[PDB]
Design an enzyme around this catalytic site. Structure first.
Site, PDB file in Angstrom:
ATOM      1  N   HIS A  41       0.816  -1.154   0.108  1.00 37.61           N
ATOM      2  CA  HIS A  41      -0.026   0.073  -0.039  1.00 37.61           C
ATOM      3  C   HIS A  41       0.883   1.218   0.058  1.00 37.61           C
ATOM      4  O   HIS A  41       0.284   2.344   0.013  1.00 37.61           O
ATOM      5  CB  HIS A  41      -0.944  -0.147   1.161  1.00 37.61           C
ATOM      6  N   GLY A 143       2.752   5.643   9.541  1.00 35.27           N
ATOM      7  CA  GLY A 143       4.298   5.582   9.110  1.00 35.27           C
ATOM      8  C   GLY A 143       4.986   4.296   9.558  1.00 35.27           C
ATOM      9  O   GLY A 143       6.187   4.187   9.227  1.00 35.27           O
ATOM     10  N   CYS A 145       4.297   1.246   9.020  1.00 34.83           N
ATOM     11  CA  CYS A 145       4.186   0.086   8.136  1.00 34.83           C
ATOM     12  C   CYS A 145       5.486  -0.323   7.309  1.00 34.83           C
ATOM     13  O   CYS A 145       6.290   0.591   7.214  1.00 34.83           O
ATOM     14  CB  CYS A 145       3.130   0.209   7.307  1.00 34.83           C
TER      15      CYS A 145
HETATM   16  C1  LIG Z   1       1.061   1.745   8.208  1.00 32.74           C
HETATM   17  N1  LIG Z   1       1.740   2.576   7.824  1.00 32.74           N
HETATM   18  C2  LIG Z   1      -0.117   1.911   8.884  1.00 32.74           C
HETATM   19  C3  LIG Z   1      -0.237   1.538  10.220  1.00 32.74           C
HETATM   20  C4  LIG Z   1      -1.182   1.903  10.885  1.00 32.74           C
HETATM   21  C5  LIG Z   1      -1.717   3.284  11.167  1.00 32.74           C
HETATM   22  C6  LIG Z   1      -2.344   3.477  12.462  1.00 32.74           C
HETATM   23  N2  LIG Z   1      -1.709   1.997  13.477  1.00 32.74           N
HETATM   24  C7  LIG Z   1      -1.316   1.383  12.594  1.00 32.74           C
HETATM   25  O1  LIG Z   1      -0.993   0.447  12.871  1.00 32.74           O
HETATM   26  N3  LIG Z   1      -1.230   1.315   8.070  1.00 32.74           N
HETATM   27  C8  LIG Z   1      -2.500   1.909   7.836  1.00 32.74           C
HETATM   28  O2  LIG Z   1      -2.658   2.870   8.135  1.00 32.74           O
HETATM   29  C9  LIG Z   1      -3.465   0.697   7.018  1.00 32.74           C
HETATM   30  C10 LIG Z   1      -3.579   0.731   5.480  1.00 32.74           C
HETATM   31  C11 LIG Z   1      -4.922   1.554   5.069  1.00 32.74           C
HETATM   32  C12 LIG Z   1      -5.478   1.822   6.376  1.00 32.74           C
HETATM   33  N4  LIG Z   1      -4.694   1.230   7.609  1.00 32.74           N
HETATM   34  C13 LIG Z   1      -5.228   0.997   8.953  1.00 32.74           C
HETATM   35  O3  LIG Z   1      -4.463   0.601   9.656  1.00 32.74           O
HETATM   36  C14 LIG Z   1      -6.792   1.396   9.234  1.00 32.74           C
HETATM   37  N5  LIG Z   1      -7.428   0.333   9.946  1.00 32.74           N
HETATM   38  C15 LIG Z   1      -8.571  -0.395   9.133  1.00 32.74           C
HETATM   39  O4  LIG Z   1      -8.848   0.105   7.974  1.00 32.74           O
HETATM   40  C16 LIG Z   1      -9.127  -1.773   9.600  1.00 32.74           C
HETATM   41  F1  LIG Z   1      -9.858  -1.637  10.675  1.00 32.74           F
HETATM   42  F2  LIG Z   1      -9.219  -2.495   8.556  1.00 32.74           F
HETATM   43  F3  LIG Z   1      -7.886  -2.418  10.104  1.00 32.74           F
HETATM   44  C17 LIG Z   1      -6.768   2.436  10.170  1.00 32.74           C
HETATM   45  C18 LIG Z   1      -8.185   2.936  10.500  1.00 32.74           C
HETATM   46  C19 LIG Z   1      -5.807   3.810   9.702  1.00 32.74           C
HETATM   47  C20 LIG Z   1      -6.336   2.247  11.643  1.00 32.74           C
HETATM   48  C21 LIG Z   1      -4.350   0.207   4.524  1.00 32.74           C
HETATM   49  C22 LIG Z   1      -4.113   0.148   3.035  1.00 32.74           C
HETATM   50  C23 LIG Z   1      -5.167  -0.971   5.142  1.00 32.74           C
END
Ligand SMILES: *C(=N)[C@H](C[C@@H]1CCNC1=O)NC(=O)[C@@H]1[C@@H]2[C@H](CN1C(=O)[C@@H](NC(=O)C(F)(F)F)C(C)(C)C)C2(C)C
Ligand SMILES: *C(=N)[C@H](C[C@@H]1CCNC1=O)NC(=O)[C@@H]1[C@@H]2[C@H](CN1C(=O)[C@@H](NC(=O)C(F)(F)F)C(C)(C)C)C2(C)C
Ligand SMILES: CCN(CC)CC(=O)Nc1c(C)cccc1C
Ligand SMILES: CCN(CC)CC(=O)Nc1c(C)cccc1C
EC number: 3.4.19.12
Lengths: 306, 306
Positions: A41, A143, A145
């Site tokens: 992503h 950030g 990820c």
């Molecule tokens: C990577 N950098 C981030 C790590 C996230 C950010 C907040 N805490 C974490 O661990 N990954 C994301 O932001 C991913 C990414 C889109 C949205 N996302 C989420 O983690 C969202 N969660 C969901 O949509 C759910 F519930 F399905 F897990 C969020 C609402 C931002 C926490 C993609 C491509 C999944």
């Protein structure tokens, strides 16, 4: 003596962390030989993440659309491909700091260390377990990820986790290094929820052995039990069943302490039926299930790494 | 989201760990420039440790009595001296991996990471606090002495602890890197005991802010209190007094959350008077006091290091 949640030393993994930038999206990558692995992503805008077609988005990118920063050096991307939920960027330089390494897929109940990174730089290290519901209880921000989870074996780093997302209740989900998610989750920003989690019984028993090794012995009763009798009681309290494999795995701690596994099961059964009566074990008021039998042996016996 | 006990990345410190052998006694040393620092009781036999005269024991040693092993390379000792409880061995090679570093002496309540080592090799990393009674709750076995505690600031490693001994209840004592013990302990194998420990109030408040940042808000009451009224209640429960300096230090978390420090003190006061009523905060059934205000900011805001 003493017993702490201990992470592996992180230096070998630190030498592999890089920054991956695609347009405006920035996250971490893992640089091993001449390949950088990162979450797919990175190619998404914020809007794309709501319902991405990753194959289409990646079509539209060339090698020039990816910037990889390793310290003060930019690495040229000279190839790219997708493997499940991970992007693999071939770079023009192999990492001279590449450790001996493996990619492994761990089982629920197994533990690992997480090197939490932002912008390619390490923030901190902590120990996690793969929960029975295929989440981990981590600490991750925007950030993060591309941060990885790993175990060490002497000189070999076994990478087992790459971070992708956060689920309701603030728990976390990700992939192995082949890009296959742990659990039934997808890398899309749409409502998802982990199933009911359970307590990792074999790890609780390991931690009770750790307590006994440290002289915390008040919970030891005079009883034994059959494996079947223990499991019916534990199933009531949302504990995973204990298998003969688990009993066999606990053997070294049982032999060290002179406490039969089924005797410790009877002690655990009493704790589940009666509670802890306002007492602590190893400084905790709750039973702890994120130490494996090997974690207890490694920590209580001083196993070291290259 | 999420909140874990997080250690600093350990790679810079790993590059400094060596094995020091004196006759038959073996422990860890810290190699910085051309000096290796280690606990002076490396010069003791088991019998000497009961009542050592370190000055006499060191007289009897020459440079040749010390062997320093750094990986596959032996380093020749070309000078030695004693500084309080630490031995300084001048070696013929400066460590090319020496990071930017400082020696600091920390205050009770401050936290640091420990790289637990055996035979010069790292076993694991965990976070510790200097307790008000000048012990730390570590995890250390035979041969762990010379393991160090440290904090990182961007690229600078601030070494604050060297491990020397274990006290009753399984808690630990050591020195700064000038060899001066934290607390009234001595490096002699004779009966010693830590004084009554107390709870680090400013850190508990920091952790309640961490809980609120993570959405754990059930304990927030509608009250405020004066600093004097809070401190009389906390003194009853063996909590350290909260000072205006502590209030000032909590300012950034107070401003982030919009909760005045004295309002959070009223919430803590209620928890102390009434207990947690079978509930948890950030997954713990006990109030946690080993996160500083900076630890909460560093973890919840993603501060990284070189
Ligand atoms: C990577 N950098 C981030 C790590 C996230 C950010 C907040 N805490 C974490 O661990 N990954 C994301 O932001 C991913 C990414 C889109 C949205 N996302 C989420 O983690 C969202 N969660 C969901 O949509 C759910 F519930 F399905 F897990 C969020 C609402 C931002 C926490 C993609 C491509 C999944
Ligand atoms: C360094 N390698 C060890 C680390 C110890 C070993 C067990 N857990 C630890 O942290 N340091 C020692 O063994 C020191 C050392 C002599 C004895 N010692 C102790 O830690 C002893 N403690 C005490 O004598 C007391 F109570 F005073 F702290 C021991 C009984 C072995 C735990 C010297 C030179 C102090
Ligand atoms: C990639 C699969 N691994 C399986 C163990 C091969 C490996 O790690 N080889 C390796 C060795 C032997 C020494 C130093 C560095 C490396 C990369
Ligand atoms: C020893 C006291 N310190 C105080 C900061 C000086 C220092 O660390 N210098 C240093 C620098 C500037 C870069 C790389 C390596 C080192 C050792």
């Amino acid at each position: 003596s003493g017993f702490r949640k201990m992470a592996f030393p992180s230096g070998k993994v630190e030498g592999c962390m890089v920054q991956v930038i695609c347009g405006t999206t920035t996250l971490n990558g893992l640089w091993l030989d001449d390949v950088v692995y990162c979450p797919r992503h990175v190619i998404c805008t914020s809007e794309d993440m709501l319902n991405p077609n990753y194959e289409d988005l990646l079509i539209r990118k060339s090698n020039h659309n990816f910037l990889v920063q390793a310290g003060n050096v930019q690495l040229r991307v000279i190839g790219h491909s997708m493997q499940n939920c991970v992007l693999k960027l071939k770079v023009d330089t192999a990492n001279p700091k590449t450790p001996k390494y493996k990619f492994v897929r761990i089982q629920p109940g197994q533990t690992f260390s997480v090197l939490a990174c932002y912008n390619g730089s390490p923030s901190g290290v902590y120990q996690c377990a793969m929960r029975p519901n295929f989440t981990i209880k981590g600490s991750f921000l925007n950030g993060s990820c591309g941060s990885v989870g790993f175990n060490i074996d002497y000189d070999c780093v076994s990478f087992c986790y790459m971070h992708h997302m956060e689920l309701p209740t603030g728990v976390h989900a990700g992939t192995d290094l082949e890009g296959n998610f742990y659990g039934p989750f997808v890398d899309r920003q749409t409502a998802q929820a982990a199933g009911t989690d359970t307590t990792i019984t074999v790890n609780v028993l390991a931690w009770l052995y750790a307590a006994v090794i440290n002289g915390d012995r008040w919970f030891l009763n005079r009883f034994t039990t059959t494996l079947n009798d223990f499991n019916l009681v534990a199933m009531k309290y949302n504990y995973e069943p204990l298998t003969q494999d688990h009993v066999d795995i606990l053997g070294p701690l049982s032999a060290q302490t002179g406490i039969a596994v089924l005797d410790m099961c009877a002690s655990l059964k009493e704790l589940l039926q009666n509670g802890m009566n306002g007492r602590t074990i190893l400084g905790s008021a709750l039973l702890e299930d994120e130490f494996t039998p090997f974690d207890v042996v490694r920590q209580c016996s001083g196993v070291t790494f290259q």
